Each structure stands twice: as structure tokens, then as C-alpha cells.
């Protein structure tokens, strides 16, 4: 979700709006991916 | 939309290029980087212009 502080992403398929895996980046909010400290290509 | 490469990695690439051309001459553009002292590469850079 682009440029949205995801404290309110599901307020406005339910599995892709829950808090199973939420990551906050500069581009927006990412749902469905796990953050990893390791670095790859 | 934000840029894909933030300024830090751009600075990292520039520093990598600068260190490579300072230490290894121009041999890092062809294959493996080959070490050479700096005065003897400025000497060959003169020798390349007559
Ligand atoms: C996003 O929303 C939260 C509300 O929980 C707020 O505390 C934060 O300052 C907002 N901005 C961010 C995380 O950049
Ligand atoms: C990654 O590093 C941070 C900071 O040390 C740590 O809190 C976290 O447990 C590490 N692992 C993951 C999966 O985030």
C-alpha cells in the first residue's frame, strides 16, 4: 500500500489486511513479507 | 514515488570507483584489479601522451 501509514490499512481478502506480517518502509506498507537482517542481491 | 537507490548507495558506488581508479589504475575495467604504486601509473599516463 503506497504512502500509507499502516495503522489504518484495513479500515478502508481479509487475510491480506490483517496483522499476520506488517512491515513499514519508505515506499509505504508491505503486507505478507518477513523482514530479514541479512542482505542479498 | 521515491527513488530506488537512496543517496547512500550512490555515494558508495562513487567511493568504490574512486578507490579502484586510485589503487589499481585502469586495469580494473578490463579484468581483475591489479595493484600498482601511484607514481608509476602517473608515469605511464605521461608516457601515453608522448
Ligand atoms: C504512524 O502512525 C502512528 C500511530 O500508531 C504514529 O505514532 C506515527 O508517528 C505515524 N508515523 C510514522 C510511523 O512514521
Ligand atoms: C535483526 O536485528 C535486530 C536488531 O539487532 C533484532 O532486534 C532482531 O531480532 C533481528 N532479527 C530479525 C528477524 O529482525
UniProtKB/Swiss-Prot annotation, chain A:
Changing residue 33 to V: In strain: 19B/501Y. Changing residue 3 to G: Increase of pseudotyped VSV particle production ex vivo. Increase of viral load in hamster upper respiratory tract. Disulfide bonds join 6-29. Changing residue 2 to H: In strain: A23.1. Glycans are attached at residues 5, 37. Attaches the virion to the cell membrane by interacting with host receptor, initiating the infection. The major receptor is host ACE2. When S2/S2' has been cleaved, binding to the receptor triggers direct fusion at the cell membrane. When S2/S2' has not been cleaved, binding to the receptor results in internalization of the virus by endocytosis using host TFRC and GRM2 and leading to fusion of the virion membrane with the host endosomal membrane. Alternatively, may use NRP1/NRP2 and integrin as entry receptors. Binds to host ACE2. RBD also interacts with the N-linked glycan on 'Asn-90' of ACE2. Cleavage of S generates a polybasic C-terminal sequence on S1 that binds to host Neuropilin-1 (NRP1) and Neuropilin-2 (NRP2) receptors. Interacts with host integrin alpha-5/beta-1 (ITGA5:ITGB1) and with ACE2 in complex with integrin alpha-5/beta-1 (ITGA5:ITGB1). May interact via cytoplasmic c-terminus with M protein. May interact (via N-terminus) with host bilirubin and biliverdin, thereby preventing antibody binding to the SARS-CoV-2 spike NTD via an allosteric mechanism. This is Spike protein S1. It comes from Severe acute respiratory syndrome coronavirus 2.
Amino acid at each position: 500500500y503506497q504512502d500509507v501509514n499502516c495503522t489504518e490499512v484495513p479500515v478502508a481478502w481479509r487475510v491480506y489486511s490483517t496483522g499476520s506480517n506488517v512491515f513499514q518502509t519508505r515506499a509505504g506498507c508491505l503486507i505478507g513479507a518477513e523482514h530479514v537482517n541479512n542482505s542479498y542481491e | 514515488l521515491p527513488p530506488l537507490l537512496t543517496d547512500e548507495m550512490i555515494a558508495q558506488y562513487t567511493s568504490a570507483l574512486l578507490a579502484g581508479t586510485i589503487t589499481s589504475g585502469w586495469t580494473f575495467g578490463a579484468g581483475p584489479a591489479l595493484q600498482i604504486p601511484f607514481p608509476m601509473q602517473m608515469a605511464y599516463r605521461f608516457n601515453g601522451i608522448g
